[PDB]
Amino acid sequence: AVSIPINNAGFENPFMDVVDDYTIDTPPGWTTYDPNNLVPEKRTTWTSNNGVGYVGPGTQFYNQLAPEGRNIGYIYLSQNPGSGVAGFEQILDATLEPDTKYTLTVDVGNLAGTFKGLSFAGFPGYRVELLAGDTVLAADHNNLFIKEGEFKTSTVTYTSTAKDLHLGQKLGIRLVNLLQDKFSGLDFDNVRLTTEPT
């Protein structure tokens, strides 16, 4: 298996100085996936947003460190459950090749605890998608159980054929908060994509 490079794959940029601090602007390498217009252009804390968070020693919200490095990438939706889905997207330069198995892996985090009166109990559900063009080739919609305060690795696989309709289209990755329950913040880290062509 050969790795396909992913920009800002660990959400390590921007660098953060203080544990549990966070940015509220889309991290470099990624764009905001927002089909239901839940995330504003002008960002503020306490409203729907995305960014990075420093999950380091002494974090109050996990029983572990970030899966990789210092930071995680998060999507927080304050709208009520059922309002839509949102998250991160990254379109790669690599294109879909025939007779190839693609393996997309990402760690998904269930924030625990409470912050200034807002409980982090509960989890909104996640979906990890592998795209070619605008088509979702394969996705893991919420199959893993993630305990409060831990991360778990999601794996998504797709195998192309020699006559796949989407051959030559750009590969893409989406990391989605399903907003199916509250607390509706969701963390991701350590994105990896491999191929095993013939």
Added chain:
Amino acid sequence: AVSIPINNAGFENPFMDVVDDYTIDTPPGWTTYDPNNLVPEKRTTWTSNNGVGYVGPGTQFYNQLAPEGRNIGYIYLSQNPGSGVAGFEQILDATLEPDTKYTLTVDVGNLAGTFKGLSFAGFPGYRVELLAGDTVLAADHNNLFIKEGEFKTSTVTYTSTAKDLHLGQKLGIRLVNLLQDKFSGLDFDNVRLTTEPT
């Protein structure tokens, strides 16, 4: 793990006398899932339809028999790729219970060969969904590679918590043809759902 009963779980009803024959009406136990209005009420062969098919000895379209029994359940969409998704749905009497792991398994078939000038080469993609009410709790969107002429088992899992928003809602199953490529017929068989509550 305790099995939850599923009506017409193997698509064995109606009974079929001739290998490779098929019905074009929704099988009992299931309804037609058709969010994009691709499947007509008045059914004809050669247009979008669903039904059962007898995959028995001497079948021309598989290198194996039906996963279970005589028949499979199919969804055939003749619209072009990208037109929408359709399939089967079944709403169960069982309701979502707290602190329970649900395991949904179904065999998915990739029809092979050709029939009267129409090639069965290619595969449209599948999605298997576990529902509570109208919410997709978990789904396997097309993660398995299925060779031409075989079936493979898809597994979908969901673990509920003690305060799940959808507790007490009816469980449901959807079996979906993604219409992401042609040939855009898709087979299913041997649906099973288990729970492992505390």
